[PDB]
Structures are given as C-alpha cells and as structure tokens.
C-alpha cells in the first residue's frame, strides 16, 4: 500500500498473514523472487529493500538512485534485477555479487514500467516521456527506442513463455501489442474508459487483463 | 541574558547624558519587569504607557545616595508597580555595599514601588531592607553629578533632575 | 520557504508573508490620525 | 514529505503555472473559492479541473475532493502551500480548495487543457 | 542662505526615507536597532513608531 | 515563487503611491521648490478662470489657453511615445523572442499525412516551422507524408493545431512525446519513393521508429 507496509495474504483467510514493516515511504512496488523466498520491495525513499519468507529481515537495502525506486524487474534467471528509479536510471545490480552491472540511461521522465524478457538478453523500460527504450544485456546497448502512445507508459510485460509480443500501456487509453522482438502494434487495445493503469499476461498466452482508471477490468480473449 | 534599561538624565533643562541600568532578572524577575513596563509600556491607565518616562529624582544625598523616580506624587510618596499596588521583596541576595546599585526604595516591609535609589556609596544598613532592582552598567558620571547636585530642606534638590527619556537597550 | 515581495522588492519569510502584506502598507495618516 | 496525504502534491515547476492559471480564471470570472463551492461546482458537473492545498489543519476536509474528483471525471491536484492558493485567488484569507469552471468561448480554453494534461500526468 | 540648505536637505532625507526598504517583522526590526545602537524604545513608542524610527535612523545612516 | 496582491490591496498600493506623489509635489510648492501650480484652463474653462483678460485681449487670452492647452498634450504625447521606445528595441528581438524554454525537453510530433501533393501547404508547414523556430524535417513517399516537428511546447501545441484544424487525406499525429536533445537540423524537404531510403535517412539521427510506425500505421489501414 501506500502507508509503506506489506502485506502478505493468502488465497483463503481475506486478513493477511504477514505484516512486514520497516519502511516510511510509500510503497511503490512490490515483486517477488522467481524462486520465491526473496521479494523486492521498491520505495519513494530512494532505495529497494529485500525480505524473506524463513528470515522475515532486511536481506539487502541497497540505494544508489538519486530519487524513488519506482519499479523493480528481476530477471527470469535470477541472476541480476534492474530496479529503475524516478529520476529517468535504471540500475542493473547482481544478485550473486551486489554490484551494479548495466546503467539504463536515457529517458527523460521516470520510469513506470519495467520488465525483463525471459530470452535472458533483453530488457525493456517504459518511461514517462511516452517512449519505451528496449536495450540488450549482452550487446549493453539501446537496441530500440518504441514510441507506443502519446502518455506515460506505466505498463511494459511480455509473454512469460517465450516473449514474441510486448504489451505496452500508458495513460492514452489504449493499449499497443508491439511484439516484444516485432515491435509491431500488431492490435490496439481501446475500449478503455480511462487511463490504463496496470496490464499482465496469462501464463498461456490466450488472455489479457489490463486494469484501467475508471475500475473495471478489461479480459483480451481471442475470437 | 539580563536586561538592560537607559534612562537619559536632564538636570536644570541640561542633558548630562544617558545613564545605562541593567537589571538582575534572575535574582529579582519581578522589579525587573516592573521596571521593563515602567520603561516604554503598552497600557497602564485608560490605554496610557504609565511609567518611570518624566518622573524626577525627589531626594538627592551627597554620597549616601539618590532616591527617585515616583511618578504619581513627585515628592516620593507614590507607590505604583506592575502588580496593581505595592508588591513584596524578591530576595535579600543582593547586597548594596558596592556604588551604582538601584535598588527599589520603600517605606517598609512589602512596600516597594515605582520609586528607585541609585546607591552612590556602601550603604550596610540599606541590607536586607531593601533588594537590589539592578546595577548601572554605564553612565556612573551622571549619576556622580546628580548625586552631587545642591540639595535644600528634606534632600530636596534646588536644580529640576528629571529623565527626558527612558526604554530598553 | 522564501517569497519576493510584491510591494517591497525583498524576500521575506512565508510564514510572515500575511502580516507583511497586512502592515507592508499601513498607511501612515493611520498613524497620524 | 510534509503531507504524505498530498498524494495530487505538484512541483515548484508545476505550481507556479497552476497559480498563474488561477489568477487568470479569477480575471475573467472563471474561478470559485473554497471547498464548498469546488463541492458544488463538481456536483453540477462544471468544474474542469479542482486544486487544493496540502496544510489543511484536519487535511479531512478537502479530502472528499479527490473522490468526488474521480466520481466526476475532474481532474485533481494538490498544492503545498494554502495562502499562495488563496493570494492566487484574489482573496487575502487562505483558500484550501479552487475549482476552475466551464465557460462557453473563453479563451483560457488552452491553457485549461495543458494544465489537465500536467495534471494527469502527475496521477500515477 | 544656509536656511534653504538645510531645508532642501531635510526634504532630500525624507525623500530618500520614501524609498527605502525596512523589513516589517518586528523582531529583525529590534535586532536591526539593537545592531545599530538607538535604544529598542523611546517614550513609549509602538511598532509603528519603531519601524519609523528605524527608517529615519537609516535615512540619516 | 512569485505572490499575487489581491484587487483591494493593489487599489490600497496605488492609492499610496499617488497620494505620495502629490505630497511630495505639494511640499515642493510650500517650500518654494517648483513655482505653484497654474489653474487648468480649456475651452470650455476660458470663460471662468480668463474671463475678465479675455474681454480686452481675447485673441491673446485664446492663444494662451491653446498653448497651455498643447503643452499639456506635448507632455503627455511625448511621455507615451518616450515610454513607446522600449518596444523599439523591446520588439521582435525582446517581445517576440522567446523560444518556450525549450532547454530541458524537445516536444516531438510526428504526423502522417496521406495526400501532400500540393506545395501550399508545404510552404506554410515550413513558413510556421520558421516562424516558431520549431525545428524537423519532412519525408514524402507513395501516399506517405511524415512530418516530424521537434520544439518547444508552445510551437508543438501550435502546430498541433495548425496541422489538424487550419490545414487540410488525412493527418493523424502518430507519435507525440519528448526526447532528452534535437535530432533533425532546420526544415528541409526530402522525397524518397522507396522506403529503405528514407529508412535509412532516418535511422542517421537515430529515428527509424518513425518509419515505421507510419508504414505500420498505412498497413493497419489498408488491412482494415
């Protein structure tokens, strides 16, 4: 939530189980590990701290940025996680080492939406400035620049599978699906009532839900 | 830090200077407030700065000491404070065996008032009767000159020895 | 924080900012009235 | 910082443009005052766009503001400080919450239109 | 004459004192005056009055 | 940052000032500074303050209210037109340039025009281009316009409106967003019929999005 507490619940009690504290600011984002002992929590106080399921402690609180860490994107490996911040940086720090790798410069707003392909190579951040730079972490380079709307994008994720398509969602409301490699706006998600806040593919491939800012809950099914 | 008054004196129309009075609030809070509203004040009778501003000195001794400063009978006969009439001593630490000491002249016990005496010598009787408003910091020669001014019947000085001004430094 | 004056040409405290404004221009035959 | 509260909080940047704008809308009659008549003007549906202060003393009382905001489709945004809102209002007193009203032909229309688009973009 | 000099030179120091900047807070007022000597109050004066005295003092300064 | 004054308390800072300023004029005149002021006298006042001169000489009386007459036009003529000089110099130097500020942020624009065969508008998109120090370029192609205007906010809220109400075949805006420096020079014209030409023109600044996007758009239009 905002107040800067986390909140772990479970898929049958409605209160929460776990009540981690800790941090002051608001709580922007908040991703779980995919080996699922560690979670990442990103904050406005200009750091990311990491938790635990079996220690429940401050594993790494690590700083760098010079504003609030927005939004945090592990890889599928596990190996590094590019945390980006709201003073338009993205920090590739290693998860094995406790170093930064890769710095995502190049964007001018904050960056709201940020995620790892699951090749393993590639990296796209979405930003403010209604472009979404999509660089390469064995080439360490900006592959592409997509302009996809004309508003903050503040939804950028693959496919979890393969990663072919790209959904990019930003405050126009509409949604672009330029393929991940493709780049295509293959389809325009409109409909959308307000500003497309949050998006996420299935696990298959066959349904996208995109939440949007007049609270309704948008399915993408294929016909 | 301690307050500090002044208090320009005018003997026979003449200004002999301004005479530099701080006052002991740590020892004597009370005469030293009184003393900060008699000094300029804000409003004392009907919305008026009532205070020591235009009083005269009344008895002026040679070497003993300079008595004054009553702004409701002149004479010293007047008796006004801050505490609506006359109000009790603050403490009996403060001795006046040192010269340029005004303490608050009084009639007795409890009796102390707007009229204030500069102590122009070592006065041991004077301990214990009275407490020590505060100490003059400057101005000792103006002092030493009203003090030395002529004196007719009862101390009564034959020259005018008024403040022309008086407020806080 | 810290304000410019619209009647004075200064920076000013903005706490101070209403009272400024309020006796910044206090009209002097008040005072002399 | 201050006011966690002021999540519609703008920058120095943005601010000083929101005042301007204000002050220009209370020239041409365009503005109302206070958090009653911003209540009124979202309920009549002719407010564009609705600013506020973030040091309110309960902060409580201009915090139905926001919901009736997304209720009606008005763009909101909070400033930090009440007296600079309310001397961009023309009023001495401090005002904690402005609307800026629909008018038909004014020539504020632009102006309205980029202050929304900076408005939202502060949302999220 | 030295009449009209002095004239013209007290209607130059109240021109200038029309001009000239002095902070309306009344405590940098008395630490101004307490920078620069002149007592905080004469005869009972007010803020107003303090805040006249400070510009006169400046004018003549 | 700056404070307004409220209506009522500009009324009370004017009305100081003046009353200031005729105190000061009315403590020359008592102190024999300045000579005391002359009765103001027109046409209509002839008659009331030179009433008993005018009978003897009223020719002489007639030129003398007309010259006070002028000379108070000759002050007030010369005053406007002295305070006028600012603008000599304050003009389209100091009053007409100011560039929107445009240090931090390039607004960029693109659009993509279907039917720009007619030079007219091209000579007004360049003419507004230059006029609003708006900088971008211009690739035609087989029913293929893009127009990609990089400026300042003002000059791209201009030309948004420019392109799209005052200038007629469609145009739709296919790209609207900022960028950290400038890409394009000044307004050039450049055709390409083939598109790995402008392809390649446009991937030199490091914009071959636009490229694409506007041959993606022309796709996802005629598939429809």
Same mark, same amino acid.
């Given at each position: 939530?905002?107040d800067g507490?986390?909140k772990l619940?479970?898929?049958d009690?409605?209160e929460p189980?776990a009540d981690i504290?800790?941090?002051?600011?608001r709580?922007a984002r908040?991703?779980?590990?995919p080996?699922g002992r560690?979670?990442?929590?990103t904050?406005?106080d200009?750091?990311?701290?990491?938790?635990d399921?079996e220690?429940?402690?401050?594993?790494?609180?690590?700083?760098?940025?010079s504003?609030?860490?927005?939004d945090?994107?592990?890889?599928?490996?596990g190996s590094?996680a590019?945390?980006g911040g709201?003073?338009?940086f993205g920090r590739?720090?290693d998860?094995r080492?406790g170093?930064?790798?890769?710095?995502?410069?190049?964007?001018?707003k904050?960056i709201?939406?940020?995620?790892f392909?699951?090749?393993?190579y590639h990296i796209a951040?979405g930003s403010?400035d209604?472009?979404c730079?999509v660089?390469d972490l064995?080439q360490?380079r900006?592959?592409?620049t997509?302009?996809?709307?004309?508003?903050?994008?503040?939804?950028?994720?693959?496919?979890p599978?393969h990663?072919n398509?790209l959904?990019t969602?930003?405050?126009d409301?509409?949604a672009k699906?330029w393929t991940?490699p493709?780049?295509?706006?293959?389809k325009?998600?409109?409909?959308?009532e307000?500003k497309?806040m949050?998006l996420?593919?299935?696990?298959?491939?066959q349904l996208?839900?995109?939440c949007?800012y007049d609270?309704t809950?948008?399915?993408?099914?294929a016909? | 830090?301690?307050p500090v008054?002044?208090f320009?004196?005018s003997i026979g129309?003449?200004?002999v200077?301004?005479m530099?009075?701080?006052?002991?609030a740590?020892?004597v809070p009370?005469?030293a407030?009184?003393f900060r509203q008699?000094?300029?004040?804000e409003?004392?009778?009907?919305?008026?700065?009532?205070?020591y501003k235009?009083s005269?000195?009344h008895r002026?001794?040679?070497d003993f000491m300079?008595?004054?400063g009553?702004?409701?009978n002149?004479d010293?006969?007047?008796?006004?404070?801050?505490?609506?009439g006359?109000?009790a001593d603050?403490?009996?630490?403060?001795?006046?065996?040192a010269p340029g000491?005004?303490?608050?002249?009084?009639?007795g016990?409890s009796?102390?008032?707007?009229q204030?005496?500069?102590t122009?010598?070592?006065?041991?009787?004077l301990?214990?009767?009275?407490?020590?408003?505060?100490?003059?910091?400057?101005?000792l020669?103006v002092?030493?000159?009203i003090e030395n001014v002529?004196?007719?019947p009862?101390?009564?000085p034959?020259?005018p020895?008024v403040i022309?001004?008086?407020?806080e430094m | 924080?810290?304000?410019?004056?619209?009647?004075?040409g200064?920076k000013?405290?903005?706490?101070k900012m209403?009272?400024h404004?309020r006796?910044?221009?206090?009209?002097?035959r008040?005072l002399?009235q | 910082?201050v006011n966690?509260?002021?999540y519609?909080?703008?920058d120095?940047?943005?601010?000083k443009?929101?005042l301007d704008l204000?002050?220009q809308?209370?020239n041409y009659?365009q503005?109302?005052?206070?958090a009653n008549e911003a209540?009124?003007?979202?309920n009549r549906?002719?407010?564009e766009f609705?600013?506020m202060?973030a040091?309110?003393?309960?902060?409580?009382?201009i915090?139905h503001?926001?919901?009736l905001?997304?209720?009606k489709?008005?763009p909101y945004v909070?400033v930090?400080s009440?007296?600079a809102?309310?001397?961009a209002?023309?009023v001495?007193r401090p005002?904690?919450?402005?609307?800026v009203?629909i008018?038909?032909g004014?020539?504020?229309?632009?102006?309205?239109?980029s202050?929304?688009?900076?408005?939202?973009?502060?949302?999220? | 004459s030295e +009449? =009209?000099?002095? *004239?013209l030179?007290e209607?130059e120091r109240? $021109?200038r004192? +029309? =001009?000239i900047? *002095?902070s309306?807070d009344?405590?940098?007022? $008395?630490?101004c005056?307490?920078?620069?000597?002149?007592?905080?109050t004469?005869?009972?004066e007010?803020?107003?009055?303090?805040?006249?005295?400070?510009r006169n003092?400046?004018?003549?300064? | 940052?700056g404070?307004?004054?409220?209506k009522?308390?500009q009324?009370?800072?004017?009305?100081q000032?003046?009353?200031?300023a005729?105190?000061?004029?009315?403590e020359k005149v008592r102190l024999?500074?300045?000579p005391?002021?002359?009765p103001?006298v027109?046409?209509?006042?002839?008659?009331?303050?030179?009433?008993?001169?005018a009978?003897?000489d009223?020719?002489?009386?007639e030129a003398?209210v007309?010259?006070q007459?002028?000379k108070?036009?000759?002050?007030?003529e010369?005053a406007?037109?002295?305070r006028?000089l600012?603008?000599?110099?304050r003009?389209?130097?100091?009053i007409?340039?100011?560039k929107?500020?445009?240090?931090?942020?390039?607004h960029?624009?693109?659009?993509?025009?279907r039917?720009?065969?007619?030079?007219a508008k091209?000579?007004?998109?360049?003419?507004?281009?230059?006029?609003l120090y708006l900088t971008?370029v211009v690739?035609?192609?087989?029913?293929v316009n893009?127009?990609v205007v990089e400026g300042?906010?003002?000059?791209?809220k201009?030309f948004?409106?420019?392109?799209?109400?005052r200038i007629?075949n469609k145009?739709v805006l296919?790209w609207?967003?900022?960028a950290?420096?400038?890409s394009?020079?000044?307004?050039?014209?450049?055709?390409?019929?083939?598109?790995n030409?402008?392809?390649?023109?446009?991937?030199k600044?490091?914009?071959?999005?636009?490229?694409?996007?506007?041959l993606?758009?022309?796709?996802l239009?005629?598939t429809d």
């Open positions: 939530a905002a507490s986390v619940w479970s898929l009690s409605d189980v504290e800790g941090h002051t600011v709580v908040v991703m779980w590990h080996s560690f979670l990442g929590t904050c406005y200009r750091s990311w701290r990491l938790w399921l220690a429940q402690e401050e594993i790494l609180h690590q700083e760098g940025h504003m609030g860490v927005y945090i994107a592990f890889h599928q490996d590094l590019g945390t709201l003073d338009a590739v720090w998860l080492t170093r930064c790798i890769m710095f995502l410069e190049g964007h001018l904050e709201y939406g940020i995620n392909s699951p090749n393993g951040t403010g209604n472009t730079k660089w064995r360490r900006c592959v592409y997509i302009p996809a709307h004309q508003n903050l994008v503040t939804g950028v994720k693959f496919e599978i990663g398509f959904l969602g930003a405050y409301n509409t699906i991940h493709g780049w295509s706006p293959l325009t998600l409109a409909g959308h307000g497309v949050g996420d593919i299935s696990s298959d491939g996208i839900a995109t949007s609270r809950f948008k399915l993408w099914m016909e | 830090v301690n008054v002044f320009d004196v129309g003449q200004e200077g301004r530099k009075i701080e006052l002991f740590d020892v009370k005469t407030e009184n008699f000094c300029t004040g409003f004392r009778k009907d919305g008026v700065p009532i205070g235009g005269t000195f002026v001794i040679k300079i008595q004054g009553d702004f409701v002149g010293g006969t007047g008796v006004a404070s801050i505490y609506r006359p109000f603050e403490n009996f630490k403060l001795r006046h065996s000491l005004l303490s608050m002249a009084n009639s016990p009796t102390n008032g707007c204030f005496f500069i122009c010598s070592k006065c041991d009787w301990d214990g009767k009275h407490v020590v408003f505060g100490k003059i910091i400057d101005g020669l002092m030493r000159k002529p004196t007719g009862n101390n009564k034959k020259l020895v022309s001004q008086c407020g | 924080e810290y304000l410019v004056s619209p009647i004075t200064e000013i405290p903005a706490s209403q009272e404004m006796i910044g221009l206090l009209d002097p008040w002399e | 910082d966690p509260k002021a519609p909080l703008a120095a940047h943005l601010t443009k929101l204000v002050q809308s209370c009659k503005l109302r005052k206070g209540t009124k003007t979202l549906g002719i407010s609705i600013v202060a040091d309110a003393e309960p902060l409580e009382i915090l503001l926001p919901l905001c997304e209720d489709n008005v909070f930090r009440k007296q809102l309310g001397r209002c023309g001495s005002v904690i919450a402005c609307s009203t008018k038909e004014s020539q504020l229309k632009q102006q309205i239109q202050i929304q688009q900076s408005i939202e973009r502060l949302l999220v | +009449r =009209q000099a002095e *004239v030179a209607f109240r $021109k004192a +029309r =001009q900047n *002095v309306t009344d405590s940098e007022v $008395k630490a005056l307490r920078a620069l000597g002149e007592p905080i004469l005869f009972g007010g803020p107003a009055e303090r805040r006249e005295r400070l003092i400046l004018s003549v300064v | 940052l404070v307004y004054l409220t009522k308390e009324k009370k800072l004017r009305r000032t003046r009353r200031e005729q105190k000061e004029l009315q024999g500074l300045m005391p002021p002359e103001k027109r046409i209509s006042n002839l008659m009331r303050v030179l009433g008993t001169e009978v003897q009223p020719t002489k009386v003398h007309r010259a007459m002028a108070r036009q000759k002050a007030h010369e406007n037109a002295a006028k600012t603008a000599e110099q003009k389209v130097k100091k007409k340039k100011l929107e500020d445009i240090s931090q942020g390039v960029i624009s693109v659009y993509r025009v039917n720009l065969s007619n030079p091209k000579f007004k998109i360049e003419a507004n281009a230059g006029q971008g690739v035609l192609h087989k029913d893009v127009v300042g906010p003002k000059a791209q201009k948004k409106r420019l392109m799209l109400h007629k145009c296919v609207e967003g900022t950290k420096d400038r394009f020079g000044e307004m050039k014209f450049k055709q390409c019929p083939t598109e030409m402008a392809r390649e023109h446009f991937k600044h490091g914009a071959e999005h636009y490229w694409d996007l506007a993606s758009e022309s796709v239009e005629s």
